[PDB]
Amino acid sequence: SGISLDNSYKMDYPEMGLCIIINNKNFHKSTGMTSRSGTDVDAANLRETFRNLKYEVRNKNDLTREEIVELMRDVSKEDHSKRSSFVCVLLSHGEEGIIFGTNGPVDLKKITNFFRGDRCRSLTGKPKLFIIQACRGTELDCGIETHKIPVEADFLYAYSTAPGYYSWRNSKDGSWFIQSLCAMLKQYADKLEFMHILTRVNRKVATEFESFSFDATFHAKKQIPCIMSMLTKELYFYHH
């Protein structure tokens, strides 16, 4: 055949892959963690958005830390040979490096390690996308008026917020990041490469949202998401 280029992930396997959505709304009383009003809006929006991208969506609600680890282990042991990619969305409380089960924390590294290139061989060389709506600390942004491969290769972490910062969720509309991510995927997934979609998400979150609070400490605050890419190729949700 003619000249070939290898700059984009092969996304024309028989299946796009799994989209695992972990939606933690209600936490065990002993943890002292508040319920996450608005997260069901996020979970429904993600289910519909990824359905239209032809992902096999599995929604899970209110999982303990043990259930999260077991679920991720089990999913990583499925045969993904016929799948182009893998997506996991985590909606919960968090801190830097941590997402909360309903009864306590899970290290994000423990979750993602199951999918390392050496530990999930049917995903080696395929994009592994972790979308994380959770706090990464307690900082607030005041804003300003205007051949081997590495085992860590081929992961993308689409964080809702900058390292060290709270992440904002509206109890009626859903989280700022997930609202914006779904809108940009709906508008651009048939048009733009994934990093360019996520850059539009960054702009939407940064420009269109600002917190309103009766508490001066939490009022008029801003958010920038954080794209963390270890991908080695361009990612388009469509194929030719």
């Binding site: 919960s92 409380h93 709506q133 706090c135 809702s160 709270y166 904002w168």
Partner: peptide, 4 residues
């Protein structure tokens, strides 16, 4: 608006 609430934080996570």
């Amino acid at each position: 608006d609430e934080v996570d």
